[PDB]
Design a protein around this ligand. Structure first.
Ligand SMILES: *[C@@H](O)[C@H](C[C@@H]1CCNC1=O)NC(=O)[C@H](CC(C)C)NC(=O)OCc1ccccc1
Ligand SMILES: *[C@@H](O)[C@H](C[C@@H]1CCNC1=O)NC(=O)[C@H](CC(C)C)NC(=O)OCc1ccccc1
Lengths: 299, 302
């Protein structure tokens, strides 16, 4: 038993990380085949300043890139943008390129961050995409280019690359197509996040986790229809529930329908009365249904 | 800029995990060289009752082990107990054996758990050893043999192997010499966890982390001596502070002495009661000062 926020093992990703420096900027790249992908602000001459990305590209000196994986030195052959990323062709194919694909994560979905410090993998932890396209992680100077990934059905997907932090502390990256999650710009000027909407799917998963862990104090055989829950959700900053299917296994094992747990949400959102659930003091939307299934049942 | 409980990368460990099956039991082994280490209850006929490990080992037949990882089949050459672990010699050397050492972790120290499910590494997460030898993780059937490790100054240390779960949900394992942390037995009979003692050093580190993150509702310009704080800590289940040297740089960057945070600890222990710190609802002792420094400043990564 027990519930902890987890990362999928990082081993297949770690050999793809390279250090990328240009000028005084130093961040991380993803080396696959003969291509390195990194955040394009590595070529900005002053990141404290609105960047004319287009003059920075047209005046780039390819030899002023410094790219290395331990004592493998990579030279840049060509450089272009793909959205908010630089796509650099390099002079050597990564011999440890794993089979992989690209996709985007959606709000509510969890994924893994390999946090890299100026080219060196340092830590790995799980996160969850919020409704405004941000994650709450732990990033500082030198960590841009840190990559997010997921392992599904035996295949590796790259889903995230880190670019910046908002004034409220939220963290903002792109997919590997160069599209910034949430639509934010890769510029130093002020950028605000809209209201956060809690993932109802994830909070249901959380309460199922609590029931599986033997913690049932909050639950009741009273239930609420999807429709009533969804009318309440819209006026309480919770997502609407589109279908119960993702919960079929949790409901089968526990014997609790989704609809009884929807009644729990509406009630518990008014407060826990100084009790806890899985040691949290308020509803937690950080665990997806599959995250719970993996941890509680091992599949 | 955020604080999250983190693990160091797992790549050097993943290739060392194998499935170990005997009878109806399935768990994980640590394959290094031509040696597999795994919890000895893999061989037990019935883990729901107390076990005579010495007698069961005498009836074991080495061809009844199945040890495997993907396209690797390992046959067992010999077996013996070292503490609560089986040490098996197998017929092939692990070609991806990392350089490594064994050591023990102590209370308040952090390390990494690679959770492994019937031979498949499934997840990695950081933990912190509690005063009674336990960790608060997530472990289920099939995850015994899961390994704990720490990377310090370029050296991979193996520090933990998983064995069991106490009645209160606390998780218990051994070091890699087969000594169980906290002295619990590898038996199904109920054993109690003593009282938990919070690590004061880690709580101070957590409060420093909050301050760096711009969260300071809880702090004042009032302090408490070490001797006063240690007197309190003895009677409120907190460790005593031996010295403030580990916090010099943290103290220099925030402007707050350890002694100010000590007063915060005594005050905040009665309750946050409605506010939060770095989204936590009560004092948290799961981060060491070095863990904090890594995340705030990105240096001492081992
Ligand atoms: C990596 O290049 C860096 C990651 C930031 C640094 C602090 N926490 C992060 O996630 N990205 C930036 O510095 C980014 C630069 C481009 C958007 C031009 N700027 C940024 O994030 O400014 C906000 C900020 C900077 C430094 C500390 C706290 C917030
Ligand atoms: C690994 O084989 C397994 C891991 C336990 C099982 C549940 N959570 C864990 O950490 N270890 C055992 O099953 C162990 C058997 C030996 C000590 C003989 N028994 C155990 O931990 O009993 C307590 C328990 C069993 C099942 C569910 C919850 C607690």
């Amino acid at each position: 038993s027990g519930l902890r926020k987890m990362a999928q093992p990082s081993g297949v990703v770690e050999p793809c990380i390279v250090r990328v420096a240009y000028g005084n900027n130093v961040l991380n790249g993803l080396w696959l085949g003969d291509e390195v992908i990194c955040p394009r602000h590595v070529i900005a001459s002053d990141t404290s300043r609105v960047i004319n990305y287009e003059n920075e590209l047209s005046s780039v000196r390819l030899h002023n890139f410094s790219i290395a994986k331990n004592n493998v030195f990579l030279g840049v052959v060509s450089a272009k943008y793909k959205g908010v990323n630089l796509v650099l062709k390099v002079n050597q194919v990564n011999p440890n390129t794993p089979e992989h694909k690209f996709k985007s994560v959606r709000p509510g979905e969890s994924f893994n961050i390999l946090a890299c410090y100026e080219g060196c993998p340092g830590s790995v932890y799980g996160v969850n995409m919020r409704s405004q396209g941000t994650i709450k992680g732990s990033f500082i100077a030198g960590t841009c280019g840190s990559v997010g990934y997921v392992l599904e059905n035996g295949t590796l997907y790259f889903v995230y690359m880190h670019h910046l932090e908002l004034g409220n502390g939220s963290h903002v990256g792109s997919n590997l197509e160069g599209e910034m999650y949430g639509g934010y710009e890769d510029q130093p000027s002020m950028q605000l996040e809209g209201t956060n909407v809690m993932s109802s799917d994830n909070v249901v998963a959380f309460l199922y986790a609590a029931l599986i862990n033997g913690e049932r104090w909050f639950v009741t055989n009273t239930s609420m229809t999807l429709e009533s829950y969804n009318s309440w959700a819209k006026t309480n900053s919770f997502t609407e529930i589109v279908s119960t299917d993702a919960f079929n296994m949790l409901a089968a094992k526990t014997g609790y329908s989704v609809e009884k747990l929807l009644e729990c949400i509406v009630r518990l959102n008014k407060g826990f009365g100084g009790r806890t659930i899985l040691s949290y003091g308020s509803l937690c939307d950080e665990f997806t249904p599959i995250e719970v299934i993996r941890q509680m049942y091992g599949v």
